[PDB]
């Protein structure tokens, strides 16, 4: 069970970026996906998560109206859609999976490799 993300991007401020993450080795719709970012010099910033089955999401208050998540189960792929990019958005964008035992966050042991976005 691995997570495979797309490539890196370079954007100017005011731009938007979309980062994919493919569900290799496991059922796409059987485990909710998280998105976490790490800007240079920073710790780990949570952006939100998406339910690959239902399309349900939760996002950080910091990004209301700015960070969106979508999915397309026909290709087993989840996506992170980030707009209003600024210089603070330079960083590594990672996809990750939790155990969701009881449908509640436990901790995430499966991570994608992360992609970088420069702004």
């Amino acid at each position: 069970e691995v997570l495979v993300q797309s490539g890196a991007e370079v954007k100017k401020p005011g731009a938007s970026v979309k980062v994919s993450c493919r569900a290799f080795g496991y059922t796409f719709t059987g485990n909710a996906l998280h998105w976490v970012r790490q800007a240079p010099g920073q710790g780990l910033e949570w952006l939100g998560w998406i339910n690959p089955h239902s399309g349900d999401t939760t996002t950080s208050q910091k990004f209301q109206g700015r960070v969106y998540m979508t999915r397309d189960k026909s290709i087993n792929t989840a996506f992170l859609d980030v707009t209003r990019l600024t210089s603070d958005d330079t960083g590594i964008y990672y996809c990750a999976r939790d155990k969701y035992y009881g449908n509640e966050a436990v901790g995430m042991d499966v991570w994608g490799q992360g992609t970088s976005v420069t702004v």
Binding site: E1, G25, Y26, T27
Partner: protein, 428 residues
């Protein structure tokens, strides 16, 4: 007090045996014009098959107990035989042959045809292989076909094909196939990486001896499975991680004659050769073969000893056991395959037209002469070995070759209805 409550849709099963059905790719439906196995009487495969990996399911597998092998055994034989029902008996053609050498693997034989065209008789000639016919001891000029005193041989209807199309086998509703996805799993025992499969991948009905080909390469190392690696009564199945290329040919542009031996009845026979006589042969990359073989030893020595001498020349059995064989372009080649094992590469091959579906009882099929030259190539993907620590190639039958693929799967039956105690009593 707990109460009995019925729960339906319980995700449990028990191991079970049922019949799997075929599923075709797309083209096979319309290959009925020639192809025996790639029939029209077969539903399509799922264009988008699903697979579910299970989290905590560990089950025991045993490839030598895999009953799917028996189904394939019977199905191939039955379908093959069904296709030959309307074909031509060669019984009256066994009467006589006056032979000399081709101008001695191939004989130029003349013959006397018994009353043919109602009140007429005729004489003809044809080319024959020494592997299909034998001399009369007190003549040494006259010949007969080898199988004549036991049974009937028919010439396959010209409109025939045995192309080994990768037909899929699917489970019926109420059943499922569990697959072992553990790349390091041996032939028996528990497997933890297990997934649910409704239908398997396609498996080509390849017929060969002393060679596993055109599929199923190992996970970056040579993988060897055996029932024991101990008992000399058992055999060893070897999977290669890389294939070895083999190029085979019969560079003789042959023609064929249609001989009528009565109104309404005829058969084809080998006619003249256009051009010279070339020997059938196969080109195996030597370096790839032996580099791989060195790697095979690296894996094999784990069970048999680090300085142990392994892999000697083919030996034991009659020529169809000792020689390597395949249908190149549909033509039947018997290759010495001793060069490959001349140390513990181009091989000569012989041609034979009377064949069995692995092994028949009494009866046999005759492969009609093929017009033009033979060219084919293939992917060597594995070996079957014979214990003597010398190993030699060969052994087994169709079920060993089928098993070498089927080992990945087992069939179970879904048992959704059950009960459990609850705190809830029925209300009335």
């Amino acid at each position: 007090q707990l109460w009995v409550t019925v729960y339906y849709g319980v995700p449990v099963w028990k191991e079970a045996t049922t019949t799997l059905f075929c599923a075709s790719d797309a083209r096979a439906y319309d290959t009925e014009v020639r192809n025996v196995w790639a029939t029209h009487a077969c539903v399509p495969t799922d264009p988008n098959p699903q697979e579910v990996v299970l989290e905590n399911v560990t089950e025991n597998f045993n490839m030598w107990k895999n009953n799917m092998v028996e189904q394939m055994h019977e199905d191939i034989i039955s379908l093959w035989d069904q296709s030959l029902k309307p074909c031509v008996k060669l019984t009256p053609l066994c009467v006589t042959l006056n032979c000399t050498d081709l101008r001695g693997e191939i004989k130029n034989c003349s013959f006397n045809i018994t009353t043919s065209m109602r009140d007429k008789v005729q004489k003809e000639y044809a080319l024959f292989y020494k592997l299909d016919v034998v001399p009369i001891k007190n003549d040494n000029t006259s010949y007969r076909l080898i199988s004549c005193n036991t049974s009937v041989i028919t010439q396959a209807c010209p409109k025939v094909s045995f192309e080994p199309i990768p037909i899929h086998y699917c489970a019926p509703a109420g059943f499922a196939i569990l697959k072992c996805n553990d790349k390091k799993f041996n032939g028996t025992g528990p497997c933890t990486n297990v997934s649910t499969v409704q239908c398997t991948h396609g498996i080509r009905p390849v017929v060969s001896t002393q060679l596993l080909l055109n599929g199923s390469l190992a996970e970056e190392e040579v993988v060897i499975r055996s029932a024991n690696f101990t008992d000399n009564a058992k055999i060893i199945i070897v999977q290669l991680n890389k294939s070895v290329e083999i190029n085979c040919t019969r560079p003789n542009n042959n023609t064929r004659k249609s001989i009528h031996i009565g109104p309404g009845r005829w058969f084809y026979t080998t006619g003249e050769i256009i051009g010279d006589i070339r020997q059938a042969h196969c080109n195996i990359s030597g370096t790839k073969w032996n580099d791989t073989l060195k790697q095979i030893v690296v894996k094999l020595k784990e069970q048999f000893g680090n300085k142990t001498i392994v892999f000697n020349h083919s030996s034991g059995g009659d020529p169809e056991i000792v020689m390597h064989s395949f249908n190149c372009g549909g033509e039947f080649f018997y290759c010495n395959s001793t060069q490959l094992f001349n140390s513990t590469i181009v091989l000569p091959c012989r041609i034979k037209q009377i064949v069995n579906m692995w092994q028949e009882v009494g009866k046999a099929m005759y492969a009609p002469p093929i017009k033009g030259q033979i060219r084919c190539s293939s992917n060597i993907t594995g070996l079957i070995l014979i214990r003597d620590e010398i190993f030699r190639p060969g052994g087994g039958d169709m079920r060993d070759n089928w098993r070498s693929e089927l080992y990945k799967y087992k069939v179970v039956k879904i048992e959704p209805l059950g009960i459990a105690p609850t705190k809830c009593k029925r209300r009335v």
